């Protein structure tokens, strides 16, 4: 019997809304050390992978590894029915036909017990074949999201140039072009505004903006994002969590 009592429903709502658009049907694996769920989009170039360790939760009674066939649209509809003062708890019996979600308010008030039906997506559980990335950069997430937004406004193909320790985005469209050249920044006052490039290998890669527009949606969970780039290995965008991550795996178009 799984019983994952959170600390605040906004955490899980943002966790889901970070990737509820790219993918739509996932398998949440409630194992004995938290929750882990990976999926791939229909275009098969984007792989979402989420890990919420047991530390992020408040209570965890799951004693047997269970699987939940979540449909992200219905679950987002359910999560939109949550307040900002509720301790959402996900309960599931031995053989789960449906999942129970309770947004019991801290002060004694109306408990919100929703029963969401589950499916069996019968998919495979995947994992990245790891490799030493050519450059593991860290960058404030809001700035990255703004950069992707204003660049994708121009064209539909964003390029990244990691050379000589200056992260560079370029986009060459029909109405013109746009080139952002941010230097590696570091400061003691604002730790979020920190950009430390790696001179391991120069990286010149171009990704489709139609996928970065979905990557940048999970920009609220992590105040800063870690982008790992390699000319052969597929790029990774890691949004760090309190006890996990919401990392995306994207492959440059070719």
């Amino acid at each position: 019997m799984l019983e994952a009592k959170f600390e605040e429903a906004s955490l899980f709502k943002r966790i889901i809304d970070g990737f509820k658009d790219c993918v739509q049907l996932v398998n949440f694996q409630c194992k004995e050390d938290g929750i882990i769920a990976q999926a791939v989009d229909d275009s098969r170039v984007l792989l979402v992978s989420l890990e919420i360790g047991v530390e992020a939760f408040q209570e965890y009674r799951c004693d047997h590894p269970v699987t939940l066939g979540m449909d992200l649209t219905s679950l987002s509809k359910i999560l939109r029915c949550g307040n900002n003062t509720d301790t959402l708890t996900l309960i599931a019996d031995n053989t789960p036909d449906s999942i129970i979600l309770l947004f019991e308010d801290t002060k004694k008030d109306r408990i919100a017990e929703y029963s969401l039906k589950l499916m069996d997506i019968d998919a495979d559980f995947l994992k990245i074949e790891e490799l030493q990335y050519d450059s593991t950069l860290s960058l404030p997430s809001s700035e990255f999201s703004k950069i992707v937004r204003d660049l994708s406004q121009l064209s539909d193909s964003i390029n990244i140039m990691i050379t000589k320790e200056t992260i560079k985005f370029v986009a060459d469209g029909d109405i013109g072009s746009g080139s952002v050249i941010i230097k590696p920044f570091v400061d003691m006052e604002h730790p979020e505004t920190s950009i430390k490039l790696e001179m391991d290998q120069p990286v010149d890669l171009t990704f489709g903006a139609k996928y970065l527009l979905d990557i940048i949606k999970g920009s609220s969970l992590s105040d800063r994002v870690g982008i790992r780039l390699s000319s052969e290995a597929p790029a990774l965008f890691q949004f760090d969590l309190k006890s996990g991550f919401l990392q995306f795996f994207l492959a440059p178009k070719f």
Binding site: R44, F125, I128
Partner: protein, 109 residues
């Protein structure tokens, strides 16, 4: 049913399949075998399901390829037919692939 099979491309290559448990999809399958210690009581039903799937698939595969040979008129020669208007076209290859996957799944016991 998310296929995600034989689609090796930009990202669908160099990816793993952790081979979760059967009938429960329990990731705690560190112990070898197609089943975890929790739902081991169903070890006589999942094998039946897999074996009967393999039976149906191999029967269909044999029927389709033997039918292709009869149509091609030749038995000792290779049938390299480009006719895409034949109902059995697009189906023989699908059944070959699906039977390959189901046989590889049956080979875990």
């Amino acid at each position: 049913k998310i296929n995600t099979g034989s689609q090796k491309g930009g990202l669908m290559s160099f990816i793993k399949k952790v081979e979760a448990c059967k009938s429960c999809k329990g990731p705690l399958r560190k112990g070898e075998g197609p089943l975890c210690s929790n739902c081991l009581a169903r070890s006589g039903e999942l094998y039946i399901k897999a074996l009967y799937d393999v039976r149906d698939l191999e029967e269909k595969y044999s029927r389709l390829w033997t039918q292709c040979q009869r149509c091609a008129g030749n038995l000792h020669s290779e049938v390299l037919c480009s006719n895409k208007n034949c109902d059995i076209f697009y189906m023989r290859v699908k059944v070959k692939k699906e039977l390959q996957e189901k046989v590889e799944q049956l080979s875990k016991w």
